[PDB]
Design a protein around this ligand. Structure first.
Ligand SMILES: C[C@H]1[C@H](O)CN1c1nc(N2C[C@@H](O)[C@@H](O)C2)cc(C(F)(F)F)c1C#N
Ligand SMILES: C[C@H]1[C@H](O)CN1c1nc(N2C[C@@H](O)[C@@H](O)C2)cc(C(F)(F)F)c1C#N
Lengths: 296, 301
């Protein structure tokens, strides 16, 4: 296997750049506008391609002009779109993103079209042999657990040399998703999910949630500008300071940059410490740039 | 393709992609919230007046700036969907096709707007100088870049001086934004539309006060028109006789977005058809009122 598969969402980000965030009932005029392809699994694909990794995307899309824009962007990047689960019923999701130029803060108003999510049936149809690593963005937990069990089954039949590495992301504080803790060799838990569970630091979260992971898995938690932490089976907490840019201009997709960079580094055989550090390095570079161009 | 001579109604002005999201509570900065419902709409005054003229049964054309891209493709497809001739569009090499983002809170009804950037150049007088006016029976200009538009208005004046009265192009002008640059446009056109917002900003408290106060600013024999929402509309012509029409409010008000544009297009339509200013004021008020009980422009006729 050579490719890195990212299973999750693709969203059209209808971005506006403002000098100051608007006050409810106001009329600000934006600096600039752009269409950017978004969604967590989608943004991680952009980053992996830029990092020089052969990657593929798996997500639901509806035939139409929004899909044509997204597909052309995926293709322009060299993202393998051959795994896309095309839906006959529904529309492709989009969102209004407000990026504050004075601090880089991103405010998203998402429109979730109720496009059916990728099923365990869609996933059974995939020939796993081309993949080196499979990353799943937590969405439809019950259906994704069946996908994770399929990869587990594949791997039991494989020599250690050709075992598919698996990562999982729990970004939304949804009780259903917490069963995914659970599966995978690398588990990414968000600051928002951690705070929701009552943890006030990435060290508190990793010590509190490590009991929920599979034997020998690595639990990772990025805490924005405070840097990121990781905890493996050795019980040794690992840390990396952030690499903040002198001027933070766009934080939209920073966490996705972190996830893809950590996945990349580990796929390349680097240590968890090296990977934590690289993840923050790339996430920080991206924060001082508009979009993903120039992160390398 | 072939458009018969003196058949179309031209609307010069703005087209924009409005992205309207309905939220239960306004988002706090850095949040990743999910909206109730999200609509993409083709907005802009000259743009909305085109939709209405097509629905009224009028062959119409739009003239405005657009840049090649995916926003333009959405807008062009909508123009076409409402059967608007888009052959006059001034395509720009530099700039963004306008897009505005509206956030409507469902718990209080308050609208938060993030207005399009200023990057796209407006239609120039040299752009207009390239249009063959013979296919138009009427030309309506939305006040934007006043200095340039005055040269466009003078071009139509020049065209008309060498035309017989039956082949004269009728001209209307809209002053909707309260900016001093635009107030020079009162001096052009056969029909001048002044807004309630512009009127109030000049210190007028009624459409009667505005028409009596601003009539001196119009050219000889022009008609000054002012719609005052639910209070109805007024018109004042060279005879010095103030004309009025009550509003025709719908049983329930659904959507007032583009009501003024519906009024303008309906008044232009009626006059283009040879009806009296009184008949046209009334028609403008009827159509604008029908639209208010409707979501969008779909069933206004
Ligand atoms: C992915 C995490 C690793 O923990 C380092 N990363 C960063 N995340 C930031 N976020 C702002 C977004 O709104 C999210 O809250 C996360 C900002 C920065 C920076 F400080 F540079 F601006 C860095 C970095 N480096
Ligand atoms: C254009 C003017 C003519 O005066 C008739 N029109 C109406 N405008 C309304 N507006 C309320 C919002 O603020 C819009 O901006 C304007 C509402 C109504 C109605 F009462 F029906 F709802 C009517 C009518 N008829």
């Amino acid at each position: 296997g050579s490719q890195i598969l990212c299973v999750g969402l693709v969203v059209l980000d209808v971005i506006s750049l403002v000098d100051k965030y608007p006050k409810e009932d106001s009329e600000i005029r934006c600096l600039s506008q752009r269409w950017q392809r978004g969604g967590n699994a989608s943004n991680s694909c952009t980053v992996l391609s830029l990092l020089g990794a052969p990657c593929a995307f798996m997500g639901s899309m509806a035939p139409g002009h929004v899909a044509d824009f997204l597909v052309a962007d995926f293709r322009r990047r060299g993202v393998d779109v051959s795994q896309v689960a095309w839906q006959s019923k529904g529309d492709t999701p989009s969102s209004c993103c407000i990026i504050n130029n004075s601090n880089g803060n991103r405010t998203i108003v998402l429109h979730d079209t109720s496009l059916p999510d990728v099923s365990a049936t869609d996933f059974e149809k995939v020939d796993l042999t081309q993949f080196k690593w499979i990353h799943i963005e937590g969405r439809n937990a019950s259906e994704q657990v069946k996908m994770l069990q399929r990869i587990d089954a594949h791997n039991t039949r494989q020599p250690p040399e050709q075992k598919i590495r698996v990562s999982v992301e729990v970004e939304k504080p949804r009780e259903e998703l917490f069963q995914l803790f659970g599966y995978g060799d690398v588990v990414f838990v968000s600051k928002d999910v951690a705070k929701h569970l009552g943890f006030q630091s990435a060290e508190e979260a990793l010590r509190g949630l490590y009991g929920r992971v599979r034997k020998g898995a690595v639990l990772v938690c990025a805490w924005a500008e405070e840097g990121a932490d990781a905890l493996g089976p050795d019980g040794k907490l690992l840390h990396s300071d952030a690499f903040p840019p002198p001027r933070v201009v766009d934080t939209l997709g920073a966490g996705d940059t972190f996830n893809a960079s950590v996945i990349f580094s580990l796929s390349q055989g680097r240590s968890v410490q090296e990977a934590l550090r690289f993840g923050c390095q790339v996430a920080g570079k991206k924060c001082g740039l508009q979009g993903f161009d120039g992160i390398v």
